[PDB]
């Protein structure tokens, strides 16, 4: 089997991608964040607390008629903003694209944090990381991904974001016309359950590449490209004024400026970032500071290739018994 679904982002800035999930019976349509760095599919449902729920489309699970309560199940999960959501579980049928798995656990929330009220066109999220950082307790559960893979053609799934415009997720198979020249894959190390991987370095606008290892995750619930303080403060020292705003939380630029591109490096592969993929523009309205899409990853632990460096490539998760990630231009 395969599936294919268009994701869109959810405003001006790329701030995040939303993708529509049918589940239940009849299909109750949700526009899910696909998150390849956590675990959990968790939707805004009919127990979410109402003063939490502010324009998002909820999940009824009564109004499934193949949902069951997955009985004594719960999970609690926190992001990396320090956003999080709670509640218990059902089981019941998901489809993503044409591709079906029944008997997903839909995490229902019970609570979530003011970042998700906030976030109207976030009805949810659906986690593509390794099932390892599952959070439901006490029997942890499966993604979707892994409860599809041995049926799909190819145990894959692809991510082609727009920068600005809509991309595409596919499941099972690898869309030969959406890139240019060839993938280069790369090693995973799933000992954190992430997609783990290790750039082979990296250059800032017409620079030289420099060689030097960077091990990082790509993470498609990650808005920006958070990377080592060396090379975070080498790419910003070449944009006149840009600096580090402890107000603001990371690097500003005027936005005077035009911004030089960035390249990582997968293997001997380059994969370049244009300029504008970095600018996420004025700081508030009116504003004549920018907010920069690459920032330090020093308080995080962990070096993020968020949707700002995804974007730029033509990603496969490859979930063979020996995980790759690949990446090729587009
Ligand atoms: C801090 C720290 C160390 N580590 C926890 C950082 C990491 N953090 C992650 C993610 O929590 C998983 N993916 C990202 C994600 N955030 C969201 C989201 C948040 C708020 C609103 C809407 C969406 N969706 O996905 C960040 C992986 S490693
Ligand atoms: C212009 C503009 C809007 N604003 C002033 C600047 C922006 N701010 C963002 C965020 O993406 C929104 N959330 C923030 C955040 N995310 C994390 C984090 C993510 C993953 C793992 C660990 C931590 N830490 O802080 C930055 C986009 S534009």
Redesign the pocket.
Same mark, same amino acid.
């Given at each position: 089997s395969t599936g294919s679904a268009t994701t869109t982002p959810i405003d001006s800035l790329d701030d995040?991608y939303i993708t529509p999930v049918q589940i239940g019976t009849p299909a109750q349509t949700l526009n899910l964040?696909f998150?390849? *760095? =956590?675990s959990d599919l968790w939707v805004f449902s009919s127990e979410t607390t109402a003063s939490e729920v502010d324009g998002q489309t909820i999940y009824t699970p009564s109004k499934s008629t193949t949902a069951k309560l997955l009985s004594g199940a719960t999970w609690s999960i =926190?992001? +990396?903003? *320090? =956003?999080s959501s709670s509640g218990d579980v059902y089981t019941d049928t998901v489809s993503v694209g044409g591709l079906t798995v029944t008997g997903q656990a839909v995490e229902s929330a019970k609570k979530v944090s003011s970042? #998700?009220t906030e976030?109207s066109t976030?009805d949810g999220?659906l986690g593509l990381?390794f099932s390892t950082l599952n959070t439901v307790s006490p029997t942890q559960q499966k993604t979707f991904f892994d409860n599809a893979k041995a049926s799909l053609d190819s145990p894959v799934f692809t991510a082609d974001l727009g920068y600005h415009a809509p991309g595409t997720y596919n499941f099972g198979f690898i869309d030969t016309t959406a890139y240019t020249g060839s993938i280069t894959y790369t090693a995973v190390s799933t000992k954190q359950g #992430?997609w783990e991987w290790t750039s082979t370095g990296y250059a800032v606008g017409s620079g030289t590449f420099k060689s030097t290892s960077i091990d990082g995750?790509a993470?498609? +619930?990650?808005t920006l490209l958070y990377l080592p303080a060396t090379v975070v403060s080498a790419y910003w020292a070449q944009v006149s004024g840009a600096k580090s705003s402890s107000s603001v939380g990371g690097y500003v630029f005027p936005c005077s400026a035009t911004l030089p591109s960035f390249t990582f490096g997968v293997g001997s592969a380059r994969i370049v970032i244009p300029g504008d993929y970095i600018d996420f523009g004025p700081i508030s309205t009116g504003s004549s500071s920018c907010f920069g899409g690459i920032q330090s990853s020093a *308080?995080?632990?962990?070096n993020?290739f *968020?949707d700002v460096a995804l974007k730029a490539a033509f990603v496969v998760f490859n979930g063979a018994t020996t995980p790759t990630l690949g990446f090729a231009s587009k």
């Open positions: 995040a964040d998150d390849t *760095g =956590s =926190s992001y +990396g903003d *320090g =956003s970042s #998700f976030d976030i999220l990381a #992430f995750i993470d498609t +619930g990650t *308080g995080i632990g962990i993020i *968020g």
